[PDB]
Design a protein around this ligand. Structure first.
Ligand code: SF4
Ligand code: SF4
Ligand SMILES: [Cl-]
Ligand SMILES: [Cl-]
Ligand SMILES: [Cl-]
Ligand SMILES: [Cl-]
Ligand SMILES: [Cl-]
Ligand SMILES: [S]
Length: 346
């Protein structure tokens, strides 16, 4: 029954059978109870602070050819850019002046920066007294080592999907096995480590989602980034169906349940498919938000949302925006860097 599954979740009887059934029920009441649960677990384990990770998308060059991704190398209908290192440090400084306690440096897999330019940049931001998160893709162990010694605190490397055949068809440059080795390496070197998947990928079944969850649980990732799949028009998946918001939201809730002291963002994709989607996610298990901090002209001063379309006046609008959001949700800003605090067990 709907009632019995919530009870198995409470006792942490996290079997394949239970996760599958929980993902299979579409009853509104069951869903609402699951979200109140995930929220209650979030309050108890990670508290009311909502942590801001300022994202600087500093280069959109990528060497890989992932099929879902607007940054894939075969996409010629994309203006490519690279910020200078100095532009980056100074932008970060501006973020820090605006209150950001974590800076995320993210890109396509762009060789130009790797490894030394990254190291020098990271060293420089760490002088600024903030946490540093990297999201640069798959690289040799030697690069992860240099960036860890350089002072990086965290690394996001979403696993996207745990079905290896699906992974290899979608990311023909690589494999799930390779992705797993990178995640493992990052964990062993002492990074705060983030994984996660897209939901509603073409060919992905509920069973695959179950496997994603079991995966996350198995490895105890510090962070889990989850969002719905959103077709990108300049890719081979332009014409595939979008991921469902409720289903993705349920993945987020379940993720909080499985990994109660972890950091779970309300991803931008979530705010893209449903109005108020980020806020909704934050009231359903999530405890982090990641505002775009990329400067013009790399970033249009234009953010589509459904119906609405936020036309901001300045480079810097989103940090104040999200602080305001956080305040209005009755949540609290982070007092510290908001890194993972491994409680709940042993
Ligand atoms: S490595 Fe990242 S940026 Fe490059 S195509 Fe794959 S998903 Fe996109
Ligand atoms: S300022 Fe606009 S784009 Fe930025 S987070 Fe707020 S509503 Fe969204
Ligand atoms: Cl990216
Ligand atoms: Cl990415
Ligand atoms: Cl982070
Ligand atoms: Cl996102
Ligand atoms: Cl992003
Ligand atoms: S990435």
């Amino acid at each position: 029954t709907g009632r019995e599954i919530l009870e198995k979740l409470e006792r942490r009887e996290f079997t394949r059978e239970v996760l599958k059934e929980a993902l299979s029920i579409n009853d509104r009441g069951f869903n609402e109870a699951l979200f109140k649960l995930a929220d209650e677990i979030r309050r108890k384990y990670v508290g009311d602070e909502v942590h801001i990770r300022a994202i600087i998308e500093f280069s959109n060059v990528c060497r890989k050819n992932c099929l879902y991704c607007g940054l894939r190398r075969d996409n010629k209908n994309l203006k490519r850019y690279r910020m200078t290192p100095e532009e980056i440090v100074e932008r970060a400084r501006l973020a820090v002046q605006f209150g950001a306690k974590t800076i995320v440096l993210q890109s396509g897999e762009d060789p130009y920066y790797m490894p030394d330019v990254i190291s020098d940049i990271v060293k420089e931001i760490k002088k600024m007294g903030v946490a540093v998160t990297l999201s640069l893709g798959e690289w040799p162990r030697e690069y992860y080592e240099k960036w860890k010694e350089a002072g990086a605190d965290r690394y996001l490397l979403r696993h996207e999907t745990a079905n290896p055949v699906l992974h290899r068809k979608l990311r023909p440059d690589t494999s799930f096995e390779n992705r797993l080795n990178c995640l493992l390496t990052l964990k062993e070197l002492g990074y705060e480590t983030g994984a996660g998947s897209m939901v509603g990928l073409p060919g992905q079944t509920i069973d695959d989602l179950v496997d994603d969850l079991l995966f996350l649980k198995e490895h105890d990732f510090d962070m889990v980034g989850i969002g719905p799949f959103i077709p990108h028009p300049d890719t081979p998946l332009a014409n595939e169906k979008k991921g469902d918001f409720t289903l993705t939201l349920k993945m987020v809730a379940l993720t909080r349940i499985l990994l109660p002291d972890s950091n779970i963002p309300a991803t931008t994709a979530m705010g893209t498919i449903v109005p108020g989607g980020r806020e909704i996610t934050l009231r359903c298990g999530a405890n982090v938000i990641m505002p775009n901090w990329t400067p013009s002209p790399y970033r249009q001063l234009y953010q589509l949302y459904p119906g609405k379309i936020c036309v901001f006046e300045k480079d810097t609008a989103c940090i104040p925006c999200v602080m305001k959001m956080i305040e209005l949700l009755g949540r609290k800003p982070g007092r510290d860097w908001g890194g993972r605090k491994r409680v709940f067990e042993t």
